[PDB]
Each structure stands twice: as C-alpha cells, then as structure tokens.
C-alpha cells in the first residue's frame, strides 16, 4: 500500500499503520458495554492558523488524536469511523479555483482515498448529509482532560451536528488507551525518530566549543534533523542549558531563549528531539563544555548514569513506575553520600524525601505522537502526593508495548537546597561545606527512550560513559 | 541604555527604539482632537500557547503591536502608556516559586524595568488597582481589522476593566499609521534582517545541487539565519519551489511541504526571509537548478529583472503604488512579446488585463514587524477591482519612510493560461506554438525590500544578473 515518505534516506511509513489503529479502536469500542450498535466515531482535524490577527501563517501540525487515527497532513479535514464495520470516511475541504494559483494542485477525492487508504472520501460541506444517510444511533466525539496540561480536548463540531445524538464521554478513555500501546508499525517510526535525534546529538557534541551561544547548537540539531531526517518539526522546544542553566528543567523557552555563552568549565545539558510525521523523540545528553569532566562533574554524571542503567535493567512487565522513580532517588542519595555532599542513613534520607531536592521532576513519561504522551493517569490511577513523585506523568504498572522516557537527573537548585537546609529533618543529612562547592554547578540529566517487552528495548544510541563522551568531543573516530 | 542582543555578530537593538515608538504614538494621540485628556493606552501582550489540548508548548512570538510599543519577549504581559505624559508601565506575571525549577530565574520587577527601560513595572494581577489609582479618563484599547487576513485584532481585557470607560476605536488607525513609517532605528534592524537573509540566500545558491529535496535548502536557510543571525523565527514559512512548483505562489505549506526533488533543467524560486527580534525580511531569488540559464530561462528571468529595476527607478514620493503595478504589467507584456510568446499590440494586451495572467499577485506590500505589514488600506483607500490589482496589499501613494517589497514575477499557470485561451478578448494574443514550450516552466519572481526616501534605498543584496547568479552558484567570493 501507499507510504508517507520525504525521500532520500527518510523512513517510509505505511498508511496501513493508521488503518491498524482504526481497527484497534473499533475492537476496543465493541467490547465497551455502553457503546450502542450503529455508533460512529467523529473526529475533527486541525485547522490552519495565523499569528494573532495577522495573515502570517503558522506551520500546520496535525492534531494528535486525528493523526493517530488517519495520518492526514492537510488542514481542515474531518474523519469518521463506523464502529460496527470499521469503515473509514475522510472529509476534505472543497477548495476554490484560486487555490491552484496560491497553494497548489487541487487534488480529487479519489487522490485522497488512494493517498490515505481510507474507504471513502467526501467533502467537508457534505458531512451532515453523509452522516444522516448512514442512520447512526449516536456520534462518539472526543472530549477529555489531558493530565499533563490540564486542558480539555474539545470535541468535533460541524453544521447540523445538533440533529444527531452525541456522546462525548465514551471515546476519550478508549482511544487514549489504544495510544498507550504501540503497534510494531508505530515502533518502527519511533526507532527512526530516535535514530535521527541520536545522530543529531552526536553532531552537536562534536560541534560544541567554548564561546558558542547555546542556540547555535539548537540550530545545528534542528538542521540535522530536518535536512537528513525530514523532521520539519521538533517534538518540543529545544532545551540547550549550559552552566547554571542546566539546572533549569524546561530552559530554552521565550523567557530564557538559549542565549547564554558557553564558558570553559561549564556542564552542558542538551534536551532535544526531532519529530517525524508527528511521531516524537526525546533525548538528553549531558557533558562538559570543554570536553573533559572534572572530578566533581564525573562524580555527579556517573551517579545519574548509574540510576539510568539501574532503572532500565529493572524495567519489566508488572513493575510499578513509582518504584523505579524511588529506585533512582535511592541511587542518587547513595552517590551523593559517597561524594560527601550527604551524610547519614540513606534509609532515613528516603523517608525524608531528600531525593526530590536533587530530582524534583518525574523519572520519565509515556512518549508517542506527543512527547508527553496520553494515558498516564486513567481513571483508577492516582497521582502520588509526595515530593518528586507528584511530578510523575504516570503511576501505572509497566506492560509490553509501552514507550517510556528514562530520564533521571541530579541538579543543584538553590531554592530547593535552601528549603532543605532550613528543615531540621533534612538539614542534618546535608554537608554545607561540601554542598557549597556545587552551588551553580547546574545539573546532569541522562535521557533515553525505551520500549517495554519481556524487558526493554533501548531506542536511543549516543555516547554515555565518561570515556565515550570525552573521546567523541575530542574529535575521535 | 540597554540593548537586545544575541551575541556573536548579531545586531544590538537599543530598547530606545521602542521608547521612540511610544513617544511617536503619544505625539500622534495628543494631536488627535477626539482623545480625552488623561487617556491611557492599554495593550495586552501575547500569552504562551500549546498544541491543541497537549502540554507541548509552542515557541512564543510576541504580538506585533505590543512588540512595536514595548519590545517585550516574555508571555503574559500588559503594557500601558499615559498619553499626556508618555509614562510607560509594563505589567509582568507574578510567577510561582516552582517557576525557578522548571522555567528559569524569577526576575524582579526592577530587573524588567532596567531591561526594557520603562518608567514603572507592576504585577499583572494588580493592573486594575494600579490604573484605578491613576484615575484615567478613558482607556484606549486596540481593535481593528487586518486588511490582509480580514481578522479582527482583539482588544485588551483584564479583571475589573468594566469599571473603566473604554474606547476601542481611536487607537488602531493611529498606531497602524505610526507602524507604516519606520524610524531610523527600525531601519537599522530591517537592514540587518535583510543582510542576514541575503547572506543565507547566497549560501543556498552555492549549495543547491540537482537531486536535492527542496526542504534541504529550506533547512540550510533557516540554520544560517539562526546560527549566524540569531533569527530563531522565519518571517513566514519558506517557499522553496522547484520546477512547476515555482508557479505556486505560496508553495511550501503543510499541504505542499517543499518535498519535490530538484531536477536538471528546473528553475528554482526560493522565497525566504528570516525574522530578528520580531522584525521581518522577505527575499525571493530565482535561478536555474543546474547553475546555467537556458535561453528561455534567461529570457523570462531578464524580463522580470527589467520590471523590477524599472519600478525601483520610478519609485518616488507621490507615486501611486497601483501605477507601479501597471508599469510592471506593461514591461512583462512587452518582453513576452519580444520572446514570441505573445503577439500584437501591447496597448491592447494591457486593456485586456493580460498582464494578470502572468502575474496574478500584487507587485508588493508594506513590510515591518509583520511580513505583510499593517496599514495598506486605511479608511478612504479602496481596493481596485481588477485582475492582479485586486491582490495588491496597498493602494496608497508612496511617502518617505515606508518599507515595501518590490516583487514582480512571471509564471505559467495552466488554469489562467487556459482561461485566456478560452477568452476571445485575450486568446488572440497568445502564440500556442511558442507558449507550449513554456508549459511546466514554473515561474520567476525577483523580490527586494526597499525603503522610500526621495527615491528608494535597496535593503537586499543578492546576485541578480544572469552573470552574477551563475557566478554565485559557481562558488565565487563577494
Ligand atoms: O517534563 C518532564 O517530565 C521532563 C523532566 C525534565 C524535562 N522534561
Ligand atoms: O503574498 C504576496 O503578496 C506575495 C506574492 C508572492 C508571494 N508573496
Ligand atoms: Mn526532554
Ligand atoms: Mn522528557
Ligand atoms: Mn516573499
Ligand atoms: Mn513578499
Ligand atoms: O526530557
């Protein structure tokens, strides 16, 4: 069948991927006792947007649920699926003649049917008429809360939808659950996205020089990913933190826009991931700006390497993700104690939640079409109200087919350190004379993407040991 | 005073640029008879957004009017200006402690005051209280229609604004008119943006090889502009049309995403422009993929070069922009006839609007903080209901200080050509035997950015003659 492809060495993605997702969704809905026979799933695709009230077009990126189901790149579409038969109908805009002049060829409905391997293609202005003729019991629309953003996903609407019976509660949990488990075809794309991003991270590490601006590496990364990988978008805004900025978890946004000069002695923390055909990647590399770890940098780095490897090794079906987070906490504390930053019983440190002082974020998250992928907190899965753990983007048990980031880190964040030092329950563990040395150190984060099977499959491939990193940065083959 | 700067060789932009804009706006409003004493301009900045319902952040780019007045890069701000005194107050978000962990240092209000060189800084949640204490007569908010998008620019709102008298009609035309005329400081930034983009276009011309995907050059352009120019954004989505795609005016959008393989014999039409600190650039270079103009390519190209230079030579104060468009039409028709594509009286061709068949878009547009900048059609300036001219983004007369693109083009667009051949009023002018040779040719567009004075100043610096282009593509220095 047909494939998405951007030529050269980019990945051919079969449109069968999306057909399988539609089938999987129907199969799941068919098992749901609340789903009426003759129900039709109705999804609305993303529309073109502009900057505020200007005519400056924003590059269109498809809505993630719609993409998962149809893989459609064009704006202004709808897509429906007959639950009982699995029949798919794509609705495309009926374009004006002038489109030929300004935007490109006005493709036929047949062209789109062939392109996307759907069962039928109709025009958007015909959606109410077409659906009316099918005599559905109910339209299943998509409404639910994203547990990372807290935003409500708004459901499909079209002219005349009020004449139909609409249910907006059933679909969201079901399609989310399908997205949690990646098909082999989806896994092929995620192998690719992480391959390209891994290559780009290596190129960045080879290119870093003292005196460069952080954003020079952001540019290089995105350039490698687009020109060599066909990745027009990144999965998220590049985080290129040097020096103290490596302690800032989502550094690189408009408020702190990767504009610091990399200095000799700095640690770099580069968190970047290209996107291909709306599939994510997410990799974080940490390394000395000047290519040689100091003793302190080596110690902090290898502590995070230890937790990273320990977590990956321990991941198997049935493992509770919060246990992996606590495992990383314990290892970090052990290492910080070995370094002399901490003293006392590690057991006592854990009970006092001292790990969260050094790793305030979650150990890792689901990844797929969104970098922070959906389904981390389905009904019945509760967020843990403790430092560190409350920032976990899922509290689920691991199962085969899940795709997760593994991203332990250790940071020296002043307001968290100062808080702990004011608290007698935590201050006793901390050696102020030693900790003082690490103020302004920044931080280290080591992030890989993995797939759960009988254990895990590692999708990311970058230099990780101190020896590997120093060799890579010294221009070694 | 302070400057925006991204280090290395990037431009230092003094925040005084924005203070001058605020001053100019106040000066204009003070002369406006309908503006009440004690009026305060109230602008709302852009807010951070995400992809749909996800937590995937979209890179924040400031709203253009707000940027023009304040040059503020942070999301979630407001800005007010006391008309009578010119006093500026910036309102910044009161951030939670956790911001320190995830986003960066929680800067003081004093930090922002020094950074942006405003008179006062307050937290956003205090805006109603602060404004109440100043006892303004009326709040001047921003509402009006963008004449390129047709969208309504939505006015500032905050909790408790209902307690104030608000006027949303006065400000928009006045601030638009200020934006139409660029200050010396603004011009320095626009020189820079067009310099960097010019350099990037040259690099693209040196790098192009048959067999490459169009998007490889898009990527190279943006990489040059960001890494060397500090241009994190482009002014618009890159249009990298090769072969028949060069006839597609806004090629490169998601529906047609620069994914064609460049072939031997193709003409390339690359319309790309980086953005620096929310100031635009817009350049279009046209050239043969293999670095060698054919006779046909040379002929079409030099015709557009002729109209470009003729328009630039003719641009003066008092000149009506639609007349420049017609001038370009006439030149294109003359040259297509000299090529044997057309035959008969050029006068008759013009009366039949034949030019619009080969150049269906406007000759050029205002440029500034937006690539299609505001103020092309103020009240009293009407859109001309004719082919080609109706697509003009302004029908104003030129005055000193305006910044315009000059972008004539010739394209071979099948449905327009076929319409002309079906039209008895136009069909006789077309020589199909010669024209057939140009089906699938694509098109040529030559775009420069200029500033109006007693004549014009050219901001763009790229190879333009056939000789210059073939030299650039051959890797020549300078
Ligand atoms: O948001 C998260 O969960 C991870 C933590 C470091 C940055 N990204
Ligand atoms: O939109 C416009 O006015 C110009 C015409 C060619 C592409 N940009
Ligand atoms: Mn990341
Ligand atoms: Mn991550
Ligand atoms: Mn252009
Ligand atoms: Mn233009
Ligand atoms: O991350």
Mind explaining what this structure looks like?
Two copies of one chain form a homodimer. Chain A is an alpha+beta fold. Chain A has two domains: 1-180, 3-Layer(aba) Sandwich (Creatine Amidinohydrolase, Chain A, domain 1), CATH 3.40.350; 181-477, Alpha-Beta Complex (Creatine Amidinohydrolase), CATH 3.90.230. Helix content of chain A is 35%, strand content 15%. Chain A has 16 helices and 22 strands. The first copy, chain A, has helices spanning 16-31, 64-70, 99-102, 109-116, 127-134, 171-180, 184-207, 214-229, 295-314, 321-338, 346-351, 355-358, 414-422, 424-427, 432-435, 466-473, and strands at residues 3-4, 13-14, 40-44, 49-50, 57-58, 78-82, 88-92, 120-123, 139-140, 144-145, 152-153, 166-167, 233-234, 239-242, 267-272, 274-275, 283-288, 403-406, 409-411, 443-445, 448-452, 456-458. In chain A, the strands form eight sheets. In chain A, strands 8-7-6-3-9-12 form a six-stranded mixed β-sheet, covered by helices on one side. In chain A, helix 1 crosses helix 6 and helix 9 (295-314) runs antiparallel to helix 10 (321-338). The radius of gyration of chain A is 24 Å and the shape is globular. The first copy, chain A, starts with a strand and ends with a helix. Chains A and B meet through helix 3, strand 11, helix 8 and helix 13 of A and helix 3, strand 11, helix 8 and helix 13 of B. The site of hydroxide ion has 5 residues of chain A, from loops. One manganese (II) ion binds at residues 271, 282, 284, 447 of chain A. The PDB classes it as hydrolase.
């Amino acid at each position: 069948g047909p494939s998405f492809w951007l030529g050269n060495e980019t990945l051919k993605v079969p449109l069968a991927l999306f057909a399988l997702n539609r089938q999987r969704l129907c199969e799941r809905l068919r098992k749901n006792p609340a789903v009426q026979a003759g129900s039709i799933v109705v999804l609305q695709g993303g529309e073109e947007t502009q900057r505020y009230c200007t005519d400056t077009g924003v590059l269109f990126r498809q809505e993630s649920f719609f993409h998962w189901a149809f893989g459609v790149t064009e704006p202004g579409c709808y897509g429906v699926i007959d639950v009982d038969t699995g029949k798919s109908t794509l609705f495309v805009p009926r374009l004006p003649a002038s489109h030929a002049t300004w935007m490109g060829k006005i493709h036929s409905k047949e062209h789109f049917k062939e392109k996307y391997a759907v069962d039928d293609v109709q025009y958007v202005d015909e959606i109410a008429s077409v659906l009316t003729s099918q005599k559905p019991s109910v339209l299943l629309t998509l409404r639910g809360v994203n547990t990372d953003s807290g935003s409500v996903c708004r459901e499909a609407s079209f002219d005349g939808i009020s004449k139909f019976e609409v249910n907006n509660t059933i679909l969201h949990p079901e399609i989310v659950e399908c997205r949690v488990f990646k098909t082999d075809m989806e896994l092929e794309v995620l192998r690719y996205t992480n391959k390209i991003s891994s290559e780009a991270h290596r190129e960045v590490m080879k290119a870093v020089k003292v005196g460069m601006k952080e954003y020079e590496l952001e540019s290089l990364f995105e350039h490698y990913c687009y020109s060599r990988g066909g990745m027009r978008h990144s999965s998220y805004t590049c985080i290129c933190g040097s020096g103290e900025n490596s302690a800032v978890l989502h550094y690189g946004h408009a408020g702190a826009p990767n504009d610091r000069t990399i200095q000799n002695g700095d640690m770099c923390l580069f968190d970047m991931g290209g996107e291909y055909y709306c599939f994510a990647s997410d990799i974080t590399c940490s390394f000395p700006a000047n290519g040689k770890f100091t003793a302190d940098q080596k110690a902090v780095y290898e502590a995070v390497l230890r937790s990273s490897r320990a977590v990956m090794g321990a991941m198997k079906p049935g493992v509770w993700w919060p246990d992996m987070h606590r495992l990383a906490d314990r290892i970090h504390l052990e290492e910080l104690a070995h370094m002399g930053i901490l003293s006392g019983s590690v057991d006592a440190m854990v009970q006092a939640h001292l790990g969260a002082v050094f790793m305030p974020h979650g150990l890792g998250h689901f990844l797929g079409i969104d970098v922070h992928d959906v389904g981390g907190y389905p009904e019945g899965v509760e967020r843990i109200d403790e430092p560190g753990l409350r920032s976990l983007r899922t509290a689920r048990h691991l199962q085969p087919g899940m795709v997760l980031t593994v991203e332990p880190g250790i940071y020296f964040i002043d307001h968290l350190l100062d808080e702990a030092l004011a608290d007698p329950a935590r201050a006793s563990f901390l050696n102020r004379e030693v900790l003082q040395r690490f103020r302004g150190f920044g931080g280290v984060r080591i992030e890989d993407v993995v797939v759960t099977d009988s254990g895990i499959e590692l999708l990311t491939c970058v230099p990780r040991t101190v020896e590997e990193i120093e060799a890579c940065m010294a221009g070694c083959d």
